[PDB]
């Protein structure tokens with residue numbers, strides 16, 4: 085069983101490298117962030133450009149949606165995160181506290197907290213309503229590449245160039261688990277599975293790994309792509325077949341069968357490193373986004 089993702093739309097508009105694409109929880113919208121300091125909103129089903137959101141003083145590495153598809157948070161080189169009202173485009177809060185570039189961000193499912201990771205080697209947990217920093221976790225000893233809440237928001241997973249992936253108790257800020265590798269290549273990406281039982285982690289040695297969080301055991305490895313420089317975002321695809329989806333430094337989107345680990349599709353068309361991919365919440369739709377020699381987002385659709 086293989087997917088048949090085919091190109092549907094190419095979304096042009098960003099004037100510099102695109103860093104992150106995310107589908108709204110309600111499936112309605114795609115948000116993109118870019119080195120051009122802009123957030124753009126696009127229709128998920130027709131690819132139609134909606135609006136430009138601006139205010140960051142420097143490039144934006146990441147953007148994430150609240151549970152109600154009404155708010156966005158962005159992580160910038162200007163050392164801030166911003167919370168935005170999607171419908172008005174207005175900046176609601178500026179989250180200040182990191183001492184350097186902010187690279188990654190997420191709302192908890194309840195969408196009252198935001199977690200961020202920074203070049204400053206810390207993970208911060210912020211109050212959505214007030215914008216105040218609630219906790220600063222001495223998370224890592226190198227830049228933090230990814231931060232993600234599990235399904236009930238009770239855990240955070242973080243990854244860093246220090247070679248570790250850590251799991252944190254949200255309430256107390258205590259580290260519950262460290263995943264260590266003997267060679268410790270930089271961990272460039274991490275995310276929980278939809279059910280929260282597993283973690284998917286990328287390392288900068290051309291490798292994706294599925295870890296049993298509960299047991300601390302690697303269950304799967306996914307290879308064949310190129311990933312030795314960029315923090316490339318990867319995904320579980322669960323709407324049709326059960327896939328792993330990633331960008332790659334050879335300008336392709338890679339799709340693997342989660343259980344067998346076999347490459348099932350490679351998506352051709354981008355003209356630069358595919359740094360971001362997103363999987364639609366309800367439909368078999370992938371968004372992909374590439375760096376400065378491409379600057380476009382592509383939307384792909386499959387029957388399974």
Ligand SMILES: Cc1cccc(C(=O)Nc2cc(-c3cnc4ccccc4c3)ccc2N2CCN(C)CC2)c1
Nearest residue numbers: 101102103104118119143144145146187227229245315
């Ligand atoms: C504005 C913009 C546009 C296009 C790409 C990037 C970028 O690549 N992001 C970034 C950078 C780094 C990073 C930068 N310096 C570093 C210096 C020393 C050691 C480690 C470092 C890690 C880490 C993460 C990230 N991201 C990539 C996009 N992703 C959605 C979240 C995380 C940003």
Ligand SMILES: [Cl-]
Nearest residue numbers: 106148232275
């Ligand atoms: Cl995500």
